[model samples]
Target: AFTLADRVTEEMLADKAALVVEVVEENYHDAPIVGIAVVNEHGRFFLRPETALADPQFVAWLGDETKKKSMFDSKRAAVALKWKGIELCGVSFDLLLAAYLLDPAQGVDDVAAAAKMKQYEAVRPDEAVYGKGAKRAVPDEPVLAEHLVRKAAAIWALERPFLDELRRNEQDRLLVELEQPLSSILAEMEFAGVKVDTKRLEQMGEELAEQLRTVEQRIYELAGQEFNINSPKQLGVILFEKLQLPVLKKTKTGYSTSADVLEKLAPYHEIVENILHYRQLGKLQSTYIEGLLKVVRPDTKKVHTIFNQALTQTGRLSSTEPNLQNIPIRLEEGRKIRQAFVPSESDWLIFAADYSQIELRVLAHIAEDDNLMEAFRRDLDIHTKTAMDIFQVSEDEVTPNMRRQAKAVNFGIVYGISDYGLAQNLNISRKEAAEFIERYFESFPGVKRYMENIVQEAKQKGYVTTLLHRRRYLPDITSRNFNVRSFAERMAMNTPIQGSAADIIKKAMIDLNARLKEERLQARLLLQVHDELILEAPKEEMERLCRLVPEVMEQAVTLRVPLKVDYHYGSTWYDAK
Candidate 1:
């Protein structure tokens, strides 16, 4: 009747496999639907690998291996079975998926939570039941073991609220939905990691490095003397003091030449342009070319990056060690990163699938405006459609300029953007930006109504949600500070639109992962660069996989607007783009 949770020490578990078996049995019986499984330490052997002994999957696989109960009786066999049942998922990572589902608004990660846990125990011993130095010695044989068991159980119970809240909340649903698909997708992606030809990468890396070096040298000349090119302090001094250039902004430490500040200064100062170019090229070289070069698995000639499913609170995906999100989509130099992602074989081509105006489509659904919905349903050129409607002009008469302005307005409205932001983006006067927004509302009154209702609803309920019931609490909606309240209100309006798009993509991704596995394809998901899923696979399966992916994404969810996917393929990522 003694529980393993009670005998959590290394000595107890080492002496008796029952220490683990008991927790396994208890978890299976009482909390199978939810669990905090432990791999315990140093628990793997021959007929049973560490993963098999430590992971839950090993238990199931061991059961299969034994045809039922044999593995349970042998202590070593049980440990191996425990590994098989529990520990197989070391390579696959999906932290954002968990975070989004847990608090879709205030996204958090395991590292942060772990830090918080450490801090909590440090600051408040009442909250510490079992971690470091909390264990008590018991003299009585029956009493000591019993006390330890009680302590472990009591401490674990304290974790119940946070875990249970996640379980009861939307995250639980995402967890269930994502498990099969995500794992399969990740495994497939890892298996199918796009091969990067080392020689080619070196060639490109060298070329880019030379170009950046030239730019850096040019920057030094502009500064009137040579200094460490990467040193921010030195660069700040030269740019602000020596050159006598207009200071755009200031950081707490000193003058700022950060990307944001650099962007604004590009038009005013000539060296700013070269500096910005230098930074961009440097990032691309280091973050992409050289960085990716190191991660390539020699045998596969592929770079495998972890896709964090449980990290982002806003339902967005993030890539690690090498962030796949910040690639150059809008610039030629940036776009070349794709060239590094070549096909595995000559016949195979890289394929890319990007959602068409995903956020705008989401906005149309949330706004539920007749004009907006009708435009989407008809598959009309959305920006042009909006321009035509707002300007009271025929489709043929809608100029490219109008469409451009409308495009900015469409996205701007979702974020509750101010006239200044819109003006800056569109290069229009503040008055003109305000007018375009007004015209947009005039053409779609229901959208205006929806935006207003979102604010009122958030004010009343203290939270906002996407169509799928993903909630984001807006404590600031009730804040006294005008700026704080304004920011929260903007987020309230945006989360329902943007967050819903995120939810839809996740659901779709989960489903796609499942379908691919069932079909027994070797292709695997590698990276999620925002609106696209980068998959690597053999040359032969290109057509089938390409068609299969779009079908999965398109059908991931239904909406008032038609969801269209733009898919492409080529020998390298650059060609696909």
Candidate 2:
């Protein structure tokens, strides 16, 4: 009699038998199988769509279920798996997820990459297997099947060591408890993408086009010619040659027609003002209007963006495809784009909750700064408090501009911004920027201490981590190059603060997801962009969610300073904001 593994190997090679069905059935639960591939003992391959598994012929080929189950006596395990309403008690491994955990910044993410990282060289690169670019197409069935079979087999081969590594680094709990579960939740949210009012978007596009035309006419009138305002070459000639304006800078091709250079020339000529306005309106038309229209799925009237969980070293989630995270909010024209983001149903509304000054609060807590913590504790306007302390003025005497400048300096500190960067941002001289930073450090010496110590620690240890120990290695912290060393030092100082804030929001999402199910609420989470959580809910549940959302967010984690959230519900995301 042969053993189960021996039988599996034999059956796999026979091409008329199926092996590993029991393992897949036990792990995959109700989650629909996407596809399947297999390899035999002789390295031959077979592949089929997941639908093939449901065919009677294939099911019969899987053979006796009892014999498969008894392969490893008394070593049974139960895994809860589900998708939509489907439920199954099956188990499976995600090789891509494991690879991401090991090193997110890897040049590529594939079976080959994972194998390369583990130094387990068994699989060929996809390029070698499939060809490249125009030459790329799925090979013959045998070849295609071998590629996928190798991938699936590698998942099994690498699973144990990856799990052990996670355990050794104390990251297993973070993975098993948080990241893994969150991936499924995020998947559902992506599938339930928020609806868009296409007609409303179209109307906005038309309005922006008209505005662009008007701005274009104004630019031509000011420049005394109807030149192509869109062309940097034409605009450069008009500005530097025709108008006789002082040249601020020059690019390799021509006069630097960049925004910063134009800003510097704004006071000198009315043409520069109109030119800047023209550029702004043009971007609104191009990026928000046309760019958005191209991606919105006509069938669903929604945009489903892919959220990359392991792309960023700081543990923050990033969106691509449509990149909802980069939607403009700083300017009124750009902010208007949010008005098109409507609830999925007419009877539902968009509910949004955003953490207020979360990063600053995290910094205050991590630095253990009594003064900074006290400001958050008392719920004072943080910028105003900083202005009062730095400018040596009473609360009433702090001018609006003072508070504005103070706010910039406060954020500049968190980012490890240089004097030049601060000066450019605030439109002040380098001396003034340096003085402002000095005053900020004097006001909150503990923050200064935190920054210095963090850089020193990173130089010694070569990595930094968040409150949850999400590590980001800074290889250039001790580099000979000034710019590289400076950047690494900033990353070392900033990652812990930024990464901790990301961790807090993620924890909130996980907790709130459970609460939604437990309470049997009609609300559904639709998006998580930065510090904000966007949900679509029935009008009837608006009041309940308003209370519940904030409570869940603020209590996600406890720190030296309390987390505070502000929320609103409206017909559109813009209104909620």
Candidate 3:
């Protein structure tokens, strides 16, 4: 019932939500609600939530995700009930999930011929309601409301390409196919489980025990005192009272025994570093070794970790049980712990792959910033190497001193760092952080424009979206509190990039899983730990799996910037590196 649109507008959605709010305020307060407000096939209100739920005949029509519905914007569509804590996500639709409803004044009822609802049994109701005596209205009994109701029926008539336009970008289609379908692939992967080498871990466990014992005794000798080394209170007492090290930070519980505070206190005492090591050893024991021991199925000798498929639809396939994620990575001992994550079959191999500079790669494409893309293509140290031109230093002239400042700016810039935060990060003045920020934008105009426009979009519409159409509501974008508002702006700038990288890896998983099955390979897609993918496959598939992984991931999606993937394979996850 409006001008034909093959697309939603960049104009803004604020005032429209303001329109929806009035109808919602009235509707939400009416008669005790048990379900959604429904528009029957007659294009008229049934007006009862219970009625909507009871007749769930149209209910099937309402929530079958595949049964596409045209809503101008899904979040705002869902948000009215949001104010009252109601949810109707059971039938969340596909990529054609959101759009800008065309102006009602210009809106009419021609949805019939540009239409498809005729097959559904009632596109004519809207036609009937719109014709004479369609004074199913007055001069102003919220004609907008009436327009919306007709808009609902009109969609079935028009086959209105809400998602088609979205799919033209192929974003909605990506979710419809990639996001929604990946859920099952991930579940099947979880059911397959990961084989853990408990014997290998027990050996490593003893090594850690020896190291822990030595370190613990050393701490005892150094402190000239013996208290529970694990007790933050006792440790703080020794470190702050008995030892008198300068306090970097403290908490109400006592003195701060946080790893960061211990790290800073390292030079002041050997005990501090030892304490940090002891803490690491303890976490490894409890979280990794002991944790793994607890979760491994006695009969299966596998850890069937549950993955958050929906989490990565917006974030990561968050995992649990030996966590598969944050498994004490980075330190040598940490890396050593991964040696226990072996291939399920004795002759099989553990394969690992990761997207290098994924989030930054997403930023380059999204920001369409040339200089940043160039760095990725050349495979240089992203933070420092790219800082060369951003800081006007030559590639060879890039020293750690210059690089560190550039590093601060590169990372913080994407987060839309406030000068005070940058100053805190780089230990510089507000003026210097501000200076670096401007020069950064000057050198990377594309990124500047991207961030500026997106932030403005959030300011006006209160939301930002990822490439996969993942939307984040930044309600605080309009906050009066400086910290809160700035935080919202930072989220506006970062969520798209972070969530897009999240989106890409997800697509990669879906593609790779299909490729393995299509080729009849023995490989199994087991884990998605952020940008990394872990698969278990036959030794015969070694070289092929390695080649197939990077190929699938790199081409997972085409973007302005090239996508790159690296691979590692071994008997265990660590050696796979």
Candidate 4:
């Protein structure tokens, strides 16, 4: 559908030209670069090299790298030739990130998709233009160039509208100040991945495999026959039919051997416990050990995870390509996976700084709860304080079980969990869960008021915003469906608290990255796990970093309650906890 009339011109790119040029110059001004373009070729949309060679003036910009004056000479010549420098930069907006921000479900597979979403009838579908599957092949340069031109025009057209939407929704600050700048920081961190101890990883893999084998054998012995313990069908028949354990749930296929069901059955039979252990060890062996080993770069001996910046609705960053973010930390088996993550140099050390009770602190600040604020201000163990308040007992009288339950309830409050959900989590009756929640509300009356008012405000406004004005639309807050509306209400209460915390960490990352560069330090930021940031530095710089990291993170945002961070340094990521 793209015709000669669809060809892009420099004037059509007026919308985001200045900002895009600023970003490119800030990040890549010193590099030997020619031009950038978005192209649709080989049934995909991506940055192509063709744009650099399209213009002779652009070629002058990339003249002999050894000659120091070539770039300056080209810039002067380009000005003399009346070539617009900003347009020559050949970038407007990051189409992928913008498309993701618009609606993550809208596949960023090709420019055709983005064009169709905007209803800008200048681009042809990639499948039609370049064919699909086995039919895919490179077309002639003239034909491909037309597709690239149309894609560029589409991006130019979409930039103004998308940014306008961001501004109208009060998310411009989040985009310009935080997300955009943080993207470069995340890119650098991903490039400088944490080193892996391959020998230690292999040992752990062997141990996990042996444990899995032993557990599988025991499960078979208990079932009185050798069957596929991995198979739900075989395991189901053994548990429900042979062992006669009470079934907690069922699927159309047969009895459900899901983890939750198995957890409930563990008290009834040793076989259930064996199955749980077998499953855990099997997952550890496959996911962490085998999965990680396959992705480690042969040259660098490190695992680089791609941070999906615009994937989550709440603006939280997600990682893929062997997701380091989801590596389990609750169980010892899962937590040990981090022990394999080591510093790159012998003199270097891994240092982690984690915000202490960040989400709860956000909640307290937003809700303005005196009890919660007092607990945080005094630097008391929050879970202990919660137990004392909820159980109507002194700090010394609070039992371990009471504190554990209290901690769960505290997090539950942040997540907007229902009585039924809390009951399932605490392994208690719904009535007991309801009573505990009521007592919690009574203890922190402001929190209850905040939840109630926020839900009402969400119903009226049809959306909620974070501290940084990152907006999340809650379309179902007034839905007639009980579960749907309940979920929306929960999200309305939870998103601002969670999203604000996410915003704080993002700003902290941006500021801290600048601080490290300004200070001319050797400490390299390695990872960001929720509220915690993992960095590596020389042993000698440890003293300075320990002071600097928390200082930057805690002061990233101003809140009603103080932000606290706890940090440590060690040879490996495990000890850095």
lDDT of each: 0.62, 0.74, 0.66, 0.73
Question: Least accurate stretch of 10 residues (summed lDDT) in model 2?
Answer: 69-78
Total clashes in model 4, counting residue pairs 3 or more apart in sequence or in different chains: 0
TM-score of each: 0.74, 0.86, 0.69, 0.84
The clash count for each model shown is 38, 11, 8, 0
Off by over 4 Å in 1: 1-100, 104-172, 179-184, 187-192, 258-270, 344-347, 390-392, 396-400, 413-419, 427-432, 518-520
Candidate 1 per-residue lDDT, tens place, 130-180, comes to: 233435222343443343333233233323344455577655555545532
lDDT (C-alpha) at residue 192 in model 2:
68
Instruction: Give the clash total for candidate 2.
Output: 11
Angstrom error at residue 349, model 3: 1.2
- Scanning candidate 1 in windows of ten residues, the lowest lDDT window is 26-35
For candidate 3, the lDDT comes to 0.66
* Predicted candidate 3 versus true structure: per-residue lDDT over 288-308, tens digit per residue: 878888888887788877564
Model 2 deviation from native, Cα RMSD in Å: 6.4
Which should have the higher lDDT, number 2 or number 3?
A: 2
